[PDB]
Amino acid sequence: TTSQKHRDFVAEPMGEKPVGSLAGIGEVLGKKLEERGFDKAYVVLGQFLVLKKDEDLFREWLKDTCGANAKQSRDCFGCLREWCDAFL
Amino acid sequence: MTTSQKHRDFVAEPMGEKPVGSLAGIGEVLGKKLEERGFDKAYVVLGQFLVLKKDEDLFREWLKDTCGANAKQSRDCFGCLREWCDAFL
């Protein structure tokens, strides 16, 4: 299943939404992503696209970059994958 | 309109799995060098554009370093991605 946060994200263009609008990215992860330059959701989309939408490599990058656990990286990947299927 | 028809076709619709050569400024020569470096679909180049926070200087330099794009090619590619993002992102 998915959260409402996921459904809200995949339903519309992301524009300049902050990184915290991604499913899985709560306060703590969002801070650490901002510290490393990923301050908006589209920058994380960028990394997902550079990695050619590879689930294992993206989720591993997210863990390495901000400490996302398995649930959090699963949620974040899923919302970017579904967003891309709808809008890219 | 002063943009190319090729820019117009790209920015008119979602890019899906379009190849890198669908981007304005990316002819066959630049497209082959990009593919060889792993940037084989236009969305992978969009990805680099987004990871660079849409910065023109950083992106155009990256494009020069990666495939040897000249100034006009890199401006055209950047402008096509910038307008695509304004339309769809």
Side-chain angles (χ1 to χ4, degrees):
Chain A
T1 326
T2 59
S3 58
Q4 194 52 52
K5 189 173 181 191
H6 169 102
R7 290 183 290 273
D8 291 348
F9 192 86
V10 300
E12 66 190 2
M14 74 187 64
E16 310 272 338
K17 277 174 176 176
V19 85
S21 303
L22 288 160
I25 307 302
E27 226 194 304
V28 174
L29 297 190
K31 195 273 288 166
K32 294 173 187 330
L33 284 168
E34 290 160 1
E35 295 175 330
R36 272 142 199 93
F38 300 82
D39 59 317
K40 303 260 139 200
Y42 72 76
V43 193
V44 181
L45 176 72
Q47 186 68 10
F48 170 88
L49 293 176
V50 166
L51 293 173
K52 299 208 234 150
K53 311 191 185 177
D54 192 284
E55 184 175 351
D56 297 344
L57 294 179
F58 176 80
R59 287 175 66 180
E60 295 167 8
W61 168 83
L62 195 70
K63 189 257 161 211
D64 293 349
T65 301
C66 70
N69 68 30
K71 183 49 155 79
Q72 296 169 315
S73 71
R74 170 170 311 110
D75 286 347
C76 184
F77 174 79
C79 90
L80 289 170
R81 181 199 70 235
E82 294 201 3
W83 187 95
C84 191
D85 286 339
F87 296 100
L88 192 95
Chain B
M1 302 161 276
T2 47
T3 70
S4 70
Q5 205 50 64
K6 184 184 197 183
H7 169 113
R8 285 176 237 146
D9 294 339
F10 190 82
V11 309
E13 62 183 1
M15 74 184 64
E17 301 271 311
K18 284 177 186 192
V20 73
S22 296
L23 293 167
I26 307 303
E28 286 181 77
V29 170
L30 298 191
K32 176 188 152 276
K33 293 184 175 42
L34 279 169
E35 291 163 353
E36 280 184 78
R37 296 279 294 263
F39 291 85
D40 55 315
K41 305 265 176 41
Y43 72 71
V44 192
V45 178
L46 174 71
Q48 188 70 14
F49 172 83
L50 297 176
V51 163
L52 294 175
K53 310 185 155 201
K54 311 190 191 178
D55 187 84
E56 183 174 356
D57 293 314
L58 294 172
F59 177 83
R60 300 179 57 185
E61 185 74 18
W62 168 82
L63 202 74
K64 184 188 76 172
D65 293 0
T66 302
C67 63
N70 66 26
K72 168 71 157 153
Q73 298 167 319
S74 72
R75 184 161 78 247
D76 289 347
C77 183
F78 173 81
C80 184
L81 287 167
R82 171 172 72 186
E83 298 201 358
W84 188 96
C85 286
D86 284 341
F88 299 112
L89 180 90

